[PDB]
Design a protein around this ligand. Structure first.
Ligand SMILES: Nc1ncnc2c1ncn2[C@@H]1O[C@H](COP(=O)(O)OP(=O)(O)OP(=O)(O)O)[C@@H](O)[C@H]1O
Ligand SMILES: Nc1ncnc2c1ncn2[C@@H]1O[C@H](COP(=O)(O)OP(=O)(O)OP(=O)(O)O)[C@@H](O)[C@H]1O
Ligand SMILES: Nc1ncnc2c1ncn2[C@@H]1O[C@H](COP(=O)(O)OP(=O)(O)OP(=O)(O)O)[C@@H](O)[C@H]1O
Ligand SMILES: Nc1ccn([C@@H]2O[C@H](COP(=O)(O)OP(=O)(O)OP(=O)(O)O)[C@@H](O)[C@H]2O)c(=O)n1
Ligand SMILES: Nc1ccn([C@@H]2O[C@H](COP(=O)(O)OP(=O)(O)OP(=O)(O)O)[C@@H](O)[C@H]2O)c(=O)n1
Ligand SMILES: Nc1ccn([C@@H]2O[C@H](COP(=O)(O)OP(=O)(O)OP(=O)(O)O)[C@@H](O)[C@H]2O)c(=O)n1
Ligand SMILES: Nc1ccn([C@@H]2O[C@H](COP(=O)(O)OP(=O)(O)OP(=O)(O)O)[C@@H](O)[C@H]2O)c(=O)n1
Ligand SMILES: [Cl-]
Ligand SMILES: [Cl-]
Ligand SMILES: [Cl-]
Ligand SMILES: [Mg+2]
Ligand SMILES: [Mg+2]
Ligand SMILES: [Mg+2]
Ligand SMILES: [Mg+2]
Lengths: 247, 247, 62, 247
């Protein structure tokens, strides 16, 4: 045989680069996944992740209550936290024994897979009673926030898209839903009559994941990295795997 | 300037009436919200509210178990209540230490925003095992109940629609789903191919809210009124805000 | 005051007292403890020291 | 440049030796710390450390009750231990369900920094009701125990002073206070009128530390060693860092 890494007859090398390009391009096909993650960051350094993975389009919708920190199998001040909610829904509406619940998220990061079309991203960042914009009567049900998404890059390749906003103020009490559509550069509408029932099925077939990790380190080590997911950490470092035309 | 309230040059007054009419009419546009609430009334006077707000259409679907009273951070007879469920799913199926669970709703009120089209409202009021009509084989999956909805009115204006039914009998054990579609007097189908993917996104973007309030008074004071929501109380009094062509 | 003494203590409520022992061990020496949190919410976020106007400011020591 | 370690022009080496000598000599100046530690050794192998660090002079004073083992966030037989105390304060004074409390220290080690003057060390080793010598009327309030302190040495340098006494007998129930004064070879009295108010301030500025470590190993690894503290272990091994005229 030829010697490795010296000619066009390194079929091992050619197949390695094709294997990776195929993964990159499959994900971008209409047969591929589009994925979203919501990360809610708590003052104790823990992070709630909610992930959903689906064909065609994908989204996550959570209440104020659902985004609050919950420590499985430990005490959570559950009665006092009921009272916290009452005071967040209406000023002076509760009888809580704290000014600020440490269960409230300090920040949110929304990441989409690179298979999303950024121009299709929509977000409804509502108040604590789940109203998008002050009162229902004056609410557009979403904002198209795509222009705010930063490209998460590794080796020059976009491995995902991130929108990050902090909630550092006492009045930052939110409900949250986000949605994006899989890229489709073709003129075949995946929701046209020929394929619409398959999009209805994708809504049922979408796989969801949620877990609270104890630290961003643990999230990077045990969630992001093992699964080849994109991520952007507090220090603005990008994680993910470049695949297009790469060994 | 002219004197206030004496001529057509009271631009403050004209803008006030326009501000309110715009809110009313925006809500009724295809860009606007449609909203539904389910209120489940318990014998201790408390009220579970489930709200969902979304573009195009909206609905809520709950199990028998999910509609039962749950007191956050307090005792709920949770083991006995497991046994209650077993006896509700099949007669004599459980080993409960009570004849009647006080966690079962005594009544349900369904309210839609005035942006719904009443003729599109559908409800699936199922038995405790989530069958619409006795056995699946003979079940139409919904009833169109719009003719039963009463107009909630303030100052002559429809501020919402209410369907109320009591569950006062031992055999009134239900699962419940309800759905309505946003008004659309145009011949532009929001679910036609041009916009169908946006309706799929609206399903993900819909914002949900749920909370148990201790009394109808607390619900009227701290939920309905602050948010300019429509409501109909036990005494048949209407709440909400008239906005069309009003200061 | 000690590090331990300045940490939040909620009289008559739960304080994660065992976990907080472990937090202290990890604060005294890196990786010295076995705590189930990265950041204890009991740690002060700020300190304000106020003296009466009867102090001589040039004598203040910390 | 000259070659490293071959001439008087190794300024890196000269500065390294000066850096260490300066630390040694600063500590011995009147501007420097004097420090004391009390280690109370329990039968479960755990060790309570109490440390105080201050200018001019330093001391620690503890009750019988305060020197007993306390396991943070675990059970401590707290009611029975109240009864133990009553029986230690006066024979047959309590109603305890044990003959010997395993919370009682088996030994005490007192260590001073090498900045103390050993001739100034004073100790009040009282009975369980905090009387130095049987009855108050006949009690000198302290013993000058300096002659009993062993030099803890590393590389020929005194890194601290240790007095160790075991409490292996049923009747060894003590209260304990110890005090030492910072070296002052000068004829400037730090407590004379010129500086007395600064010594009063040092009493308030003194920093204290206390913690229970699970084993002498853990104490040596995570308390003594990281902080360059002197120590003498059960096997008579010395720990600390020699600094005078050393790289
Ligand atoms: N929407 C897209 N989806 C996937 N890949 C893209 C997209 N737009 C550009 N690329 C490709 O990704 C790589 C990086 O291009 P990009 O324009 O993001 O980088 P840049 O111009 O250096 O940075 P930026 O545009 O963020 O200032 C290029 O190979 C480019 O062809
Ligand atoms: N589907 C609708 N959506 C919004 N507004 C409506 C609708 N139908 C009528 N209206 C308007 O609402 C106001 C009240 O009309 P409505 O017919 O409800 O009252 P009514 O005839 O006095 O009472 P009812 O018809 O309930 O006996 C009128 O201004 C009317 O033009
Ligand atoms: N009070 C002191 N404080 C600090 N250093 C001292 C003191 N006394 C002596 N030294 C110095 O410490 C080093 C060790 O002296 P030291 O006399 O302690 O040892 P030794 O005579 O071998 O042992 P020992 O005297 O304990 O039998 C010498 O450099 C000495 O000059
Ligand atoms: N505003 C509050 C907060 C707490 N409590 C009381 O304190 C007890 C414990 O408080 P809780 O909020 O439930 O905290 P934990 O029990 O410690 O945590 P968890 O319920 O999550 O296990 C409750 O039984 C409740 O009676 C109260 O009276 N009113
Ligand atoms: N039909 C029943 C009802 C109750 N129990 C027992 O009674 C105990 C307490 O009852 P539970 O139904 O769980 O009520 P609470 O503990 O008071 O309320 P909660 O669980 O919601 O805190 C349970 O441990 C269960 O063993 C039982 O044996 N069989
Ligand atoms: N790092 C930790 C933290 C907690 N626990 C266990 O969890 C239980 C409860 O945790 P704790 O820290 O003591 O919190 P609370 O009991 O809820 O609060 P408090 O002790 O202040 O009343 C303890 O008995 C302990 O066994 C543990 O195994 N290790
Ligand atoms: N001489 C004693 C010892 C114990 N008790 C009883 O035993 C119970 C538990 O004993 P305690 O000494 O308090 O040990 P723990 O509860 O296990 O530990 P802790 O209190 O430190 O959590 C107490 O409520 C007390 O009523 C008693 O009657 N008389
Ligand atoms: Cl394709
Ligand atoms: Cl429109
Ligand atoms: Cl000096
Ligand atoms: Mg509780
Ligand atoms: Mg129970
Ligand atoms: Mg505990
Ligand atoms: Mg006890």
């Amino acid at each position: 045989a030829d010697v490795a890494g010296t000619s066009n007859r390194d079929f091992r090398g050619r197949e390695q680069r094709l294997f990776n390009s195929e993964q990159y391009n499959y994900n971008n096909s209409l047969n591929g996944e589009v994925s979203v993650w919501v990360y809610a960051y708590y003052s104790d350094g823990s992070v709630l992740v909610i992930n959903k993975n689906s064909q065609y389009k994908v989204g996550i919708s959570e209440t104020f209550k659902a985004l609050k920190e919950y420590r499985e199998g430990q005490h959570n001040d559950s009665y006092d936290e009921y009272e916290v909610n009452q005071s967040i829904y209406y000023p002076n509406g509760g009888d809580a024994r704290k000014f600020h619940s440490n269960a409230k998220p300090r920040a949110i990061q929304i990441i989409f897979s690179p298979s999303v079309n950024v121009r299709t991203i929509k977000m409804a960042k509502g108040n604590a009673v789940s109203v998008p914009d002050e009162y229902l009567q004056r609410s557009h049900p979403w904002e198209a926030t795509g222009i705010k998404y930063r490209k998460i890059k590794r080796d020059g390749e976009i491995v995902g898209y991130s929108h990050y906003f902090e909630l550092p103020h006492e009045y930052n009490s939110i409900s949250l839903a986000v949605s994006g559509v899989h890229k489709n550069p073709s003129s075949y509408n995946v929701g046209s009559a020929h394929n619409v029932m398959d999009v209805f099925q994708s809504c049922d077939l979408a796989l969801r994941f949620c877990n609270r990790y104890w630290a961003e380190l643990e999230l990077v080590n045990h969630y992001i990295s093992p699964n080849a997911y994109p991520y952007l950490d507090i220090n603005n470092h990008s994680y993910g795997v470049a695949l297009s035309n790469r060994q």
